[PDB]
């Protein structure tokens, strides 16, 4: 039952200002002036042919990161001690009104004076800005994004997701209600749930909070290979079209007479892709968004300080002293872990595995060449115009392309049953 609302803005990638300029920020306001609407963070494609590119927004992760920046700067305006919302500008941007309804061009009087020297890795507590503190509805409406962002800002890697398993959640007709989700794709199930979170505040142990947790659970357990067509969780299991492909498509399917034995108790952990290729994996990135919403209303276990960079330690609602640790993983590698299990349980033939792996390899290469090249395009620009430096995608290091701890977390997840 969450009570502390704080978020962490993004840090500079070695730049001397938030990694975003005018050209970029302006182009982000897709669905309107509100930086809080969903379609500002995720696009909606009828999937399966995926991978959306843009001149300014190369990948889906590119957008997700960019929004994180836009909010990181702008938000520092009303969060100052004087809590003024439109007296100073940030890159020629200014808030529309107290309730932070929308963003717009700074008034001449404002453009006349210097901009706000926004800093990096800041941690703020909503309850400090009056207007947010007085209206729980408003606060809730916004936090959805704020948390979703900090879940991408705690570490220099990808978007953190939350995996939990507890038979006690299935209490009530919760079971019935899920079956209505059979047949839908993960993407669909997530997008809708995320969109509908801001409608109104909900209870931390309500049919919503629970289902969203169960879905996440189901997805991941399947993604890794623990659950499958012949080892279902109460007959539920996400089936992937063709694992490894450029754009994966998972569908919540049903399978009878192969229910697995789940151990009584409550278990949970945090996961996060570490390989740059997450910027091009819509599901992984949605899964986090969803997790974000979960946080907007429920207080999850703290993330162990030792798993995150200095700057983001001891953040009241998120990172704490001794808590659960983060589990990273390379996308490619996990693919095999996935296969191995399926094959071993007799659902996949050795031959099939070989095909999938071969594809997964082909994909990784493709996705990398791109990311790596766009990266240069950026450095090339930054040198060209040092007064408006930026990043169209969260910075990544060659090291990030390794296996580092995949097997480890693979087992860890499997150990939730």
């Amino acid at each position: 039952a969450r009570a502390a609302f704080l978020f962490k803005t993004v840090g500079f990638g070695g730049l001397q200002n938030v990694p975003i300029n005018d050209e970029l920020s302006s182009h982000l306001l897709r669905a309107g002036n509100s930086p809080w609407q969903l379609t500002q963070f995720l696009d909606w494609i009828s999937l399966g042919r995926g991978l959306a590119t843009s001149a300014l927004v190369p990948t889906a992760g590119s957008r997700y990161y960019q929004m994180s920046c836009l909010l990181s700067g702008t938000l520092q305006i009303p969060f100052r001690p004087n809590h003024r919302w439109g007296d100073i500008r940030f890159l020629r941007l200014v808030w529309s009104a107290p309730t932070l309804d929308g963003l717009v061009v700074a008034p001449p009087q404002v453009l006349a004076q210097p901009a706000l020297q926004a800093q990096a890795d800041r941690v703020y507590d909503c309850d400090d800005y009056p207007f947010l503190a007085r209206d729980p509805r408003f606060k809730h409406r916004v936090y959805q994004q704020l948390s979703a962002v900090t879940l991408l800002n705690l570490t220099g890697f990808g978007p953190i997701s939350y995996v939990r398993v507890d038979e006690d959640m299935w209490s009530g007709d919760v079971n019935q209600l899920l079956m209505n989700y059979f047949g839908h794709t993960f993407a669909e199930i997530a997008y809708t749930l995320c969109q509908a979170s801001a409608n109104r505040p909900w209870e931390h142990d309500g049919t919503y909070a629970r289902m969203t947790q169960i879905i996440l659970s189901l997805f991941w357990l399947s993604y890794v290979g623990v659950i499958h067509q012949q080892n279902t969780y109460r007959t539920f299991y996400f089936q992937c079209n063709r694992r490894g492909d450029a754009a994966e498509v998972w569908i919540l399917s049903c399978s009878l007479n192969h229910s697995a034995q789940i151990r009584p108790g409550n278990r949970s952990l945090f996961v996060m892709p570490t390989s740059p290729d997450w910027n091009m994996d819509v599901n992984l990135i949605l899964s986090s968004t969803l997790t974000g919403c979960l946080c907007s209303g429920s207080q999850l276990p703290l993330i162990d300080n030792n798993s995150v960079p200095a700057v983001s330690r001891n953040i009241h609602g998120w990172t704490g002293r001794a808590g659960n640790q983060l589990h990273g993983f390379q996308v490619r590698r996990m693919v095999t872990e996935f296969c191995d299990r399926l094959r071993r349980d007799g659902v996949m033939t050795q031959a099939q595995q070989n095909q999938i792996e071969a594809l997964a390899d082909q994909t990784q290469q493709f996705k990398r060449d791109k990311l790596e090249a766009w990266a240069r395009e950026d450095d090339q620009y930054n040198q060209a115009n040092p007064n408006s430096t930026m990043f169209r995608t969260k910075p990544f290091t060659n090291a990030q392309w390794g296996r580092g701890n995949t097997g480890a977390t693979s087992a860890a997840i499997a150990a939730l049953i």
Binding site: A97, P98, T99, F131, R134, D135
Partner: protein, 49 residues
């Protein structure tokens, strides 16, 4: 809905008689209503001895 416009309703810490002129016109405040008497001028004239 512009909460600012409804200050004495949306902000608990605000005294009933608070206005935000001239930057914001509140659309709900405390109004004083009267009821006066407007009589004619009466005069009783007396004579002097």
């Amino acid at each position: 809905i512009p909460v600012e416009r409804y200050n004495i309703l949306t902000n608990p810490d605000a005294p009933p008689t608070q206005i935000q002129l001239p930057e914001v016109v509140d659309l709900y405040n405390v109004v004083t209503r009267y009821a006066y008497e407007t009589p004619p001028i009466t005069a009783v004239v007396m004579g002097v001895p």
